[model samples]
Target: AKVFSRCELAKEMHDFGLDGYRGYNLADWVCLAYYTSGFNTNAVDHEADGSTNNGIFQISSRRWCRTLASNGPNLCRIYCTDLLNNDLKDSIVCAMKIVQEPLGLGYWEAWRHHCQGRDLSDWVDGCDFL
Candidate 1:
């Protein structure tokens, strides 16, 4: 599993065009991953509601992607398994679909709690992309 340091993740996100995809910057996206998955590309958490949160962005099987249960809306049009790998391209692609929704980044409660409206500059501190 590739676990990213804060700046490492910041740089990756910046390169992915996540910086201004939906008016949220690299800090906002990176900070959300920091709390939800601790920057681990392969992180997976099973939710109490019979859903599984997969990968660094914690894309959920409840609606965004498919799991073994195949019970999700698969709105991201990807398998949940695709999100759990060192290559973050899949996760980034899926994340783009999510932010297009009405909630934008607020789709992630962790982003809402930990990243929303906070001065998140520190999240991208020391990253060269700025």
Candidate 2:
């Protein structure tokens, strides 16, 4: 149950190699967390469908992860609950995997709505990693 500031989370993402992940910028990752779960690691949002979105990245339980044991495909191969931890190892790596998919950042609505095609210098204003 942690809510991180924009700059605070930016530093963590940078340290985790999410800053330049797959050639994407730090701001992109910051922007993603901003519009997704407001940097709250334990947040959970119910979807119109039966699935849910979890963690700061708000990864969908629909295809990315699962809440219960299942035989179905979990693209990220993680429990939906694992994404809610303070440690971001699972969340960051899973997000990296998601970005590598054919959809790329297109897989995230927040990126399309806010971070895409925009000036992101402000996203990492005082972060030392950048």
Candidate 3:
């Protein structure tokens, strides 16, 4: 797992053009990353239903990644393991697909619980990328 500092992750996402992606600010994305994985690229959470959420964004194996535990469509056409790599493009790409869904970032309950309607400026304020 590649662990990232807040500023580093912000710069990486900014360079990737995620700052204003889907109308969400860079701070929203950074805050989601922090609460979801604490900036660790290898974080994985096992769901009781046999699905797994992989990588910094914790994208689920169900419907997003290919995995034996998931009988989903694998809409991202990706193997769940690929999402755990230190290179974030794969994870970010899949996440972009997720946001395009009707739920947008709302697909992440954690983001809603922790980041929504909050003063997220602190998440990116100290970072130079903004």
Candidate scoring better on lDDT of 1 and 2: 1
Candidates 1 and 3 compared: the better one by lDDT is: 3
List the candidates ranked by TM-score, beginning with the highest.
Answer: 3, 1, 2
lDDT tens per residue, model 1, 54-102: 9999998989998775586888888898899998999999989999999
Ranking by lDDT: 3, 1, 2
Global CA lDDT computed for model 1: 0.88
Q: Which has the higher TM-score value, candidate number 2 or candidate number 3? A: 3
lDDT for position 57 in model 3: 98
**Candidate 2 residue-wise lDDT, 1-130, digit = tens:** 7999888888887788776667888888888889998889999998776688889899888788977733347889888999999988899888988999887887898889898889988888876655
lDDT of 3 by residue, 6-121 (tens): 99999999888998899998999999999999899999999898799899999988889898846799999999999999999999999999999998898998899999978998
What are the runs in model 1 whose C-alpha is more than 4 Å off? Answer: none
| Pairs clashing within candidate 3 | none
Which candidate comes out best when scored by TM-score?
3
TM-score of each model, paired residue for residue:
0.94, 0.91, 0.96
Worst-scoring 10-residue span by lDDT in model 2: 66-75
